[PDB]
Design a protein around this ligand. Structure first.
Ligand SMILES: CCC[C@H](CC)Oc1ccc(C(C)(C)C)cc1NC(=O)c1nnn(-c2cc(C)c(OC)cc2OC)c1C
Ligand SMILES: CCC[C@H](CC)Oc1ccc(C(C)(C)C)cc1NC(=O)c1nnn(-c2cc(C)c(OC)cc2OC)c1C
Lengths: 290, 292
């Protein structure tokens, strides 16, 4: 029941995802690893402890390096894995940039809207891709050679569910979405007309509605099970929740950067509030090829 | 009791051990660690694998912050992966031996020997004195060498507490730990091993034998005077039999080490001299370390 235009839209998004999502993370290299006023600290300390994870490094030889984080006592212990997660987030975003560049509807947009759209959807597209490698039964993001396993807590599943980011990943994983529905979610999140700095509001909004219409159609043709009733509205609701979480963790990120500077050059540009001159790295990447 | 000379003999060995055995391994730094991520050569390569599967351990590096890095060894895949922890264990050995060289130099009986005999004694006893020191930090309840922040936990070979006992090196450590020796008895074992008159290259065989006999008499007298007489009636002979077994183990692992060096060169310069890879001109590093 999909139109030819809609079939073409899903083919280009699926092709772009394949060409720009390093699911095995085999090209993620040269990352930092953990080495072998007062009220602001208390808020920040709660932020980081909510997402405590152990890092696992699998080698082609079969070896495994495992990092267990220190317990939450004293200060500057919570910042152990932050530099590594900053290097990982930066790598994920460079793939997000390449994802948008392949899309024809995005490439033809003005360079300032391209910068503004990626600046506003970076975290959201990054979390959507993390969800496709998230293992809900083990609480682990399986990123090829690297694995990020959630540390146990005293409250357990119920206490972790109080963290919105963690709750987003479990709820979205339970929808059992297809690759096409994720990539259409990524497109809908990317082409948001109400992002700060967008000038072609009407052009981006038209693009967004068509991506959403194509998602609604795809679900109607391939998801006749009763478990998938209202799946389109559920997905659209999850996308609205992710936008809310992005704001929370944009301010968390800025608090944590102030107390302790952990950001890469590209992440600092994304959080800097001439667009091209302020984002020189992002402008260069958008101009480069694949 | 013991003669005052035997008492001074123990006082000097304990003083030597105190100044040269870094029990916490705090000064063991800048070591290498495993990385983040033909027809008869096939024979020699086949022997090396068997040698490296006998003693499989996982490395734990505990941090000041409370973090725990842990390395699990790869299973054999017929490649360089089998030589993953050898660069680290070559830095560990070199670090331990330099403490052994320092141990012998503080002992007065060892300094008065000819330098060529000092080199010969250190060559034959370095593996034995290193394993004797390792046993004092070996926990048999968990199969782990507790080297300060570093831990080396033996891996379960599916026949744990039975398959590991086949390897004479592991059997040596479990058996020696069961004797529950004192610090003075450990240091006397080291002296008996160091002053072995039958090591290759020794020329003052009569002098070194006399010395070994007097350390052994001190050890026997120490056990008679400082332990319940009937229960430890044969503790001295048990210790001498463990030292005899360690000499046999030494010969076996000296060959293992030389075969592995032939295929994959991992040794440090000081270790290369120790394994033969004029005595003073063939061991110039060890010679300088003794002069200083
Ligand atoms: C395995 C991924 C899933 C889990 C998530 C719970 O990972 C972690 C696990 C643990 C930790 C701790 C640091 C240990 C608390 C953090 C993280 N996670 C991040 O550190 C992150 N996740 N996304 N981002 C991010 C990415 C981009 C492009 C961006 O551009 C505006 C802004 C961003 O943050 C505002 C970022 C920076
Ligand atoms: C805390 C110690 C760890 C455990 C404890 C037994 O051991 C291993 C456990 C595992 C491994 C593997 C590498 C994983 C196979 C090796 C080793 N062990 C060595 O790599 C060693 N242990 N001692 N030596 C050594 C030292 C000296 C001065 C020497 O001078 C002639 C000759 C030597 O070997 C011929 C050496 C070279």
């Amino acid at each position: 029941g999909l139109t030819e235009e809609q079939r073409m839209m899903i083919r280009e998004l699926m092709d772009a995802q394949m060409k720009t999502f390093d699911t095995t993370f085999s090209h993620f290299k040269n990352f930092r690893l953990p080495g072998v006023e007062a009220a602001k600290w208390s808020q920040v300390r709660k932020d980081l402890c909510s997402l405590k994870v152990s890092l696992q490094l699998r080698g082609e030889d079969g070896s495994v390096w495992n990092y267990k984080p220190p317990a939450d006592s004293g200060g500057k212990e919570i910042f152990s894995l932050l530099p590594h997660m900053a290097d990982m987030s930066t790598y994920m975003f460079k793939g997000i940039i390449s994802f948008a560049k392949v899309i024809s509807y995005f490439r033809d947009l003005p360079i300032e809207d391209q910068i503004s759209l990626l600046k506003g959807a970076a975290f959201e597209l990054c979390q959507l891709r993390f969800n496709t490698v998230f293992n809900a039964e083990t609480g682990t993001w399986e990123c090829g050679r690297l694995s990020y396993c959630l540390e146990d807590t005293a409250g357990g599943f119920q206490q972790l569910l109080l963290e919105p980011m963690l709750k987003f990943h479990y709820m979205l994983k339970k929808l059992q979405l297809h690759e096409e529905e994720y990539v259409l979610m990524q497109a809908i999140s990317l082409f948001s007309p109400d992002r700060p700095g967008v000038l072609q509001h009407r052009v981006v909004d038209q693009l967004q509605e068509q991506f959403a219409i194509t998602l609604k159609s795809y679900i109607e043709c391939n998801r006749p099970q009763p478990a998938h009733r209202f799946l389109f509205l559920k997905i659209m609701a999850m996308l609205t929740e992710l936008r809310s979480i992005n704001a929370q963790h944009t301010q968390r990120w800025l608090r944590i950067q102030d107390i302790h500077p952990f950001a890469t050059p590209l992440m600092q540009e994304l959080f800097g509030i001439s667009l091209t001159e302020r984002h020189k790295i992002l402008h260069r990447l958008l101009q480069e090829g694949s």
